[PDB]
């Protein structure tokens, strides 16, 4: 896995040259905006359970053919597996948000997931819908202005939405 600093260092080593002033300034800017990233990660981690539960409930209300007898989520075991998968996806999205780079999310979670779901028979469209609902809930929780210092988090929210959409597109 690679974060921003590791990515820049890797490109510089591949080209075999010292870091210039522009790269150092960009890394200084990345360091300066770390408190907002820590707040976003903390809020998502704290509200993960409610996010997952609400997203699952909404998904099973929108597509009732999953919980019907014979569905892909009709047992306690398969329902537990579905909830576990959604929690895993949210956890890896949080990991990518903390790292600042989608390398870990693409390498440890989304690598070969579509083929696994195709072999098992899991419908990818429902998973994408659940991921979108989780994205909306997490974005709404992150931008809550109560009990926090006022500031600008537009880039962070856009990046988090980018990770969520990447996961949804990679699983669909």
């Amino acid at each position: 896995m690679l974060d921003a600093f590791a990515k820049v260092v890797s490109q510089a080593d591949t080209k075999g040259e010292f870091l210039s002033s522009a790269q150092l300034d960009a890394l200084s800017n990345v360091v300066k905006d770390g408190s907002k990233r820590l707040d976003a990660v903390n809020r998502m981690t704290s509200n993960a359970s409610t996010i997952v539960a609400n997203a699952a409930r909404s998904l099973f209300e929108e597509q009732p053919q999953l919980i019907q007898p014979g569905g892909n989520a009709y047992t306690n075991r398969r329902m537990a597996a579905c909830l576990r998968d959604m929690e895993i996806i949210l956890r890896y999205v949080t990991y990518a948000t903390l790292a600042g780079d989608s390398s870990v999310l693409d390498d440890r979670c989304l690598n070969g997931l579509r083929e696994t779901y195709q072999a098992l028979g899991v419908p990818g469209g429902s998973v994408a819908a659940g991921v979108a609902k989780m994205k909306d809930a997490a974005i709404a929780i992150v931008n809550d202005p109560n009990g926090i210092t006022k500031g600008d988090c537009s880039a962070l929210v856009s990046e988090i939405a980018s990770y969520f959409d990447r996961a949804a597109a990679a699983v669909a």
Binding site: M1, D3, A12, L38, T94, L98
Partner: protein, 162 residues
């Protein structure tokens, strides 16, 4: 590559749990040290060529036999001097990489891993590089926490060689 953020993420991932407060505290400590880290990195990058030339010259003065003995692994000709300058430049550049990344990940991955086998195979002495690193530490011209960080990484490299 081994950085504090990736180390914390890997520690959290091997247990299948979310990120706790300890990982966030570690990342915050890295962010606090980043100021001195970048200060040291800028200071070392700005005077790279002078430091490389001085460290080479110090190695040549302390071990005068490296410029007179006839051999493939000695700097008695232009090719050997070019190789020595290239090696010292590699050392300084990787130290700068480690300073920027915030950990010894670049040092362990690019330089330390496999160093002993190379030094034995090509008949190179770690004492030459130890002397060059000692000159660099004595003449990098920093003060405070930036100097502390630079000295810490230089001592890590020296202990790897020794």
């Amino acid at each position: 590559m081994k950085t504090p953020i990736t180390e914390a993420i890997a520690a959290a991932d091997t247990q299948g749990r979310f990120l706790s407060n300890t990982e966030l505290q570690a990342v915050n400590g890295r962010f606090e040290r980043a100021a001195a880290s970048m200060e040291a990195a800028r200071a070392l990058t700005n005077n790279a060529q002078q430091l490389i030339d001085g460290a080479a010259n110090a190695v040549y003065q302390k071990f005068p036999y490296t410029t007179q003995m006839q051999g493939a692994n000695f700097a008695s000709d232009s090719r050997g001097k070019s190789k020595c300058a290239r090696d010292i430049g590699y050392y300084l550049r990787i130290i700068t990489y480690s300073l920027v990344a915030g950990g010894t990940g670049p040092l362990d991955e690019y330089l330390i891993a496999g160093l002993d086998e190379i030094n034995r195979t090509f008949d190179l002495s770690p004492s030459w590089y130890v002397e060059a690193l000692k000159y660099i530490k004595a003449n990098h011209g920093l003060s405070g926490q930036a100097a502390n960080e630079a000295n810490t990484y230089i001592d890590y490299a020296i202990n790897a060689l020794s």
